[PDB]
Chains A and B, each alone.
Chain A
Amino acid sequence: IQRTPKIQVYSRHPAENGKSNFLNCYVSGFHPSDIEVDLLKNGERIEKVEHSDLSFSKDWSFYLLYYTEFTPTEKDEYACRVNHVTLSQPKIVKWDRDM
């Protein structure tokens, strides 16, 4: 079986410019477990990014949280880039402050 990841990118708190925060990329519902998830700042890969321990749901599909501390600004654009066997090219999901 092959299942493509569902992807959500979002901040731990509603974004306020200049206030420190956490940027999250949550990937779930995917199989198999080998996946690469990068957080991007204006297209550039953020260096220090941690992630939760591999776990899975009742239907056996995996989920992972990738996160980094960050301070939003009005100009900076953030995105999550997900690389998985089910995807012919990595999927890049842009951060929207209201989603």
Chain B
Amino acid sequence: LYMTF
């Protein structure tokens, strides 16, 4: 079963 810098 598999926000920015």
A and B in direct contact, judged by CB atoms within 8 A: no
Q: Which residues of B contact A (CB under 8 A)?
A: none
